[PDB]
């Protein structure tokens, strides 16, 4: 069915899953034309598709091009997504090919099941988690290859780093989602955070910075801080009056649709 | 002037033939059903009065035998059989209406409803999509179930009306799968009409079929068929004139048929509201679109 918090778990076993997010492929910025109408200007984006065991990210780069000449493209964009999925699966081996694809957002279901008829033994399946994708472009080297892209392209990453050298994949993906809902609540302090300490650098062939086991502790702790701080700026809450309970409530709530 | 005979009637029962229905009581001398027209097909259709879940019928053409309807103690129900002695048959019809024991046909002279339900229905569609060669009539009841409905048990006893699928290798081309989806004009005109129909009068035959079997037994799978059948045309941005012009038709008398107090089972709100308001065929059933605002707004 649905994936939810009751089936949390299922995420991290041995059947191999891909979650797709389409929030970035159709990319545009709004502007005043002469006559003093408005008008739409395409920028790249990207097709979001993480396997959350593997930190294994298949980054799909969507050129302004593929629009050219297209109508409906809001419409459009969801099955360009399906489309690139599908031939993404055809091109794995068979034993890597997923058996289930989670995407982010329900408009993506009818394309992404049609584009996968001819694979009828992979589900294709909602969540009812409310993931922070949309903040991969937050991510500096993701929107640096997705902004220089002439053309279509993918480009592989693992978006865990090392981390799993030293940590679980359900506390990989607890640690990549906190720190997407943080730079997706507040890039500038998020950024700040993870940037500070110019003696704990981002290796060349790494995204995040090269933090010890104590110091993601710290960063943990000061992005909780951020999205505690940001909530209660847009609601008008004290949170210094908060409970333990409340507060975890607050940012687990903020992850369920 | 063709003639359904009866051999009793041993227990109480709701008679439907075509859209007309009369009650029988237990032992009542009724000896069946004369002056049908010929030239349609026609249905007699049982409703047993101890039991509503007894709702079954038999689909027939008077010009293809002589059928008679016999209650059966050990099946419990009213079958049809057919008489290959015509002497004896029409023996028995002259002495049942001579002794004035049988129901006429209530066809009023100006009423073509049932033709306007049966215009593209052929007894030999009927047989193909109800598989019993050894008869010439069609047994339907409310609870047989579609092929469609089996894949997703006894074959035998099945609707074999055509699958329609709109999430279907049938339905989608490789390479075509936002087209094909989102304008059904290739499944409709090249899968379903040139490849499995031939042209649109067996298409509109089926979909008759389905809504008369939805509309006289209850029969669910049969709604589905019917609702399927609209939304594929409604759904496809290129259809021909006639096509569109004659669904127009046949969905009006329909609707205006359907009893009332039955429209909140038969009616597909989804189906409806996308097919009058939403589809590429919007504005081209105006016909349908006013009886269905005038008769069934709350649906819309
Ligand atoms: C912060 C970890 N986390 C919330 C956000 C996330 O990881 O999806 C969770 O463990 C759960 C999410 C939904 C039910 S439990």
């Not at chain 1, 080297?141 to 002439?150: F, P």
């Not at chain 2, 029409?90 to 215009?119: A, G």
């Not at chain 2, 004659?246 to 409806?272: A, F, G, H, M």
Request: hydrophobic letters at 40%.
């Amino acid at each position: 069915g649905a994936m939810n918090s009751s089936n949390y778990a299922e995420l991290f076993n041995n059947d191999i899953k891909l979650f797709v997010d389409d929030t970035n492929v159709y990319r545009v910025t709004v502007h005043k034309t002469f006559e003093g109408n408005v008008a739409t200007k395409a920028i790249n984006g990207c097709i979001f598709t993480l396997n959350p065991k593997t930190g294994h990210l298949f980054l799909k780069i969507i050129h302004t091009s593929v629009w050219a000449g297209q109508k409906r493209l809001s419409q459009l964009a969801k099955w360009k997504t399906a489309e690139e999925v599908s031939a993404l699966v055809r091109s794995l081996p068979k034993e890597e090919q997923p058996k289930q694809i989670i995407v982010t957002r329900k408009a993506m279901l009818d394309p992404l099941e049609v584009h996968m008829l001819d694979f009828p033994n992979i589900a294709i399946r909602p969540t009812e988690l409310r993931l922070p994708f949309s903040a991969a472009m937050s991510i500096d080297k993701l929107s640096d290859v997705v902004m220089k892209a002439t053309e279509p392209q993918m480009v592989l990453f693992n978006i865990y780093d090392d981390w799993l050298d030293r940590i679980s994949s359900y506390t990989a993906f607890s640690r990549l989602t906190l720190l997407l809902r943080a730079l997706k609540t507040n890039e500038e302090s998020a950024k700040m955070i993870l940037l500070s300490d110019p003696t704990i650098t981002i290796k060349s062939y790494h995204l995040w910075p090269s933090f010890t086991d104590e110091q993601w502790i710290t960063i943990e702790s000061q992005m909780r801080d951020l999205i505690l701080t940001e909530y209660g700026r847009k609601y008008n809450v004290n949170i210094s009056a908060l409970t333990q309970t409340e507060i975890k409530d607050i940012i687990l709530g903020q992850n369920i649709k | 002037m063709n003639t359904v005979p009866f051999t009793s009637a041993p227990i109480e029962v709701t008679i439907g033939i075509d859209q007309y229905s009369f009650n029988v009581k237990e032992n009542q001398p009724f000896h069946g059903i004369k002056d049908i027209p010929i030239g349609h097909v026609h249905v007699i259709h049982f409703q047993h009065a101890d039991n509503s879940s007894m709702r079954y019928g038999y689909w027939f053409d008077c010009r293809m035998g002589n059928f008679y309807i016999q209650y059966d103690p050990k099946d419990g129900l009213y079958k049809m059989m057919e008489e290959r002695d015509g002497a004896k048959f029409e023996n028995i019809v002259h002495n049942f209406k001579e002794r004035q024991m049988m129901v006429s046909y209530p066809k009023i002279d100006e009423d073509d409803t049932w033709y306007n339900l049966t215009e593209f229905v052929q007894m030999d569609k009927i047989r193909k999509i109800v598989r019993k060669d050894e008869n010439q009539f069609s047994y339907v009841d409310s609870s047989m179930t579609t092929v469609q409905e089996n894949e997703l048990s006894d074959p035998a006893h099945s609707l074999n009306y055509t699958v329609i699928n709109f999430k279907s290798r049938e339905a989608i081309r490789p390479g075509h799968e936002m087209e094909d989806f989102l304008d059904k004009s290739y499944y409709l005109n090249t899968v379903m009409l040139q490849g499995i129909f031939k042209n649109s009068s067996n298409y509109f035959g089926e979909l008759q079929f389905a809504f008369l079997n939805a509309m006289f037994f209850g029969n669910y799978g049969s709604s589905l068929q019917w609702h399927a059948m609209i939304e594929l045309i409604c759904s496809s941005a290129t259809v021909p004139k006639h096509m569109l012009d004659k669904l127009d038709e046949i969905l009006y008398y329909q609707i205006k048929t359907l009893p009332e107090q039955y429209s909140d089972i038969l009616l597909n709100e989804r189906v409806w509201n996308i097919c009058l308001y939403s589809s590429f065929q919007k504005n081209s059933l105006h016909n349908t679109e006013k009886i269905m605002e005038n008769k069934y707004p709350e649906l819309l």
